[PDB]
């Protein structure tokens, strides 16, 4: 989550119906756009961010939210348009002994600006005494491990989170949804559309 992946999408066609097949029950919160109408209007570039977060901390992935994940690992701007997808992945990211590959920052001097990444590993001097890199007093490592286990509750289970962000630029749109087609009728007065040709 702290080192969240950033992916850029350009020059392709987007079918968002497949997105709904992931889980029988999952969140599909969308900001500034109705999910059922994503197939008609369309933009220039698409940014996708994916990571793993705790079950009860999925509520912090939203504009204007605050907490631990909101201002220390991943910050969403208030003027954000897009959708957030999160589904339970306990069967894939769990260890009976305990998973430890997922790290999150816990100590930082200040908050995080929207769409900002902090990968530093410097020790955090909470107090006034400079420890110069030893986990003594008021000096704790910013990163902590997510001890995922299959025996945990739904509030501690790992949720895979994918966020898509859209924007409009003066460059023409290239990444969007498919268009419709209806056979072909001959010798019959019919209204028609051909790539916007009335």
């Amino acid at each position, epitope marked *: 989550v702290y080192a969240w992946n950033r992916k850029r999408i350009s020059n392709c066609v987007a079918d968002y119906s497949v997105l709904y097949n992931l889980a029988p029950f999952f969140t599909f919160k969308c900001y500034g756009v109705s999910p059922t109408k994503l197939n008609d209007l369309c933009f220039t570039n698409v940014y996708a961010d994916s990571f793993v977060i705790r079950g009860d901390e999925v509520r912090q992935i939203a504009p204007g939210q605050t907490g631990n994940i909101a201002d220390y690992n991943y910050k969403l701007p208030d003027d954000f348009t897009g959708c957030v997808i999160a589904w339970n992945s306990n*069967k*894939l990211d*769990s*260890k*009976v*002994s305990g998973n*430890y*590959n997922y*790290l999150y920052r816990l100590f930082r001097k200040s908050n995080l600006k929207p769409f900002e990444r902090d990968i530093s*590993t410097e020790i955090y001097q909470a107090g006034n005494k400079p420890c110069n890199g030893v986990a003594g007093f008021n000096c704790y*490592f910013p*990163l902590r*491990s997510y001890s995922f286990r299959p025996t945990y509750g739904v509030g501690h289970q790992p949720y895979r989170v994918v966020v898509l962000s859209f924007e409009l630029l003066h460059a023409p749109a290239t990444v969007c949804g498919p268009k419709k087609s209806t056979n072909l009728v001959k010798n019959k007065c019919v209204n028609f559309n051909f790539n916007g040709l009335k």
Partner: antibody
Amino acid sequence: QVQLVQSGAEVKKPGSSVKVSCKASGGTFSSYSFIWVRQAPGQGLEWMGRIIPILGIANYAQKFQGRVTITADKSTTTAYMELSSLRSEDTAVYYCARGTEYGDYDVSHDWGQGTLVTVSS
Amino acid sequence: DIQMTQSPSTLSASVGDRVTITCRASQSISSWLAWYQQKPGKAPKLLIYKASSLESGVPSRFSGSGSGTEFTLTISSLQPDDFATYYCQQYNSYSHTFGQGTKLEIKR
């Protein structure tokens, strides 16, 4: 990418404790997890302990409780394992392994050349 | 503890042949698995972790297939450098146990 150097051959009497070093150089040291594997001449391999130095989690094998401890030093960027109360059936070649946070700490991405340890009278 | 077995123990194959080795556990270990090969007298090398993910630098010919309690590694076109000892490693829950070690040899 990352090279591993282990200690030399160790010949000793069974009644002592043997300390084995392992040096890893390349990339960020704080993202590495050190794993040690035994390889007996007459059988396959066996795992004893795994350590994450940046997080301070040490997990030993069930049959190696109270006999072996694993430590590491960030100043020398080295991993250390010491096994006490050696028996005649503990002679084998010891392998030092490294795990990466980007990927899996429990898997071994790089392997050392190994140290042969024998005990007799 | 989890006790797994790698079968067959001994396999004879030739260059350019297609071979596969099974690896089954006692109970469910999810899909958290690793495979290794060992030249005679040399250090082991990792090939596939998570039973599906292929390690960088390993040829793409090696393929792992399986979900849980049953895992196989398949080779399409065998080469003389592929003769080694193959070991599994389950690492779901503690006490990670490897396999017996499948040694592949030529037909004399």
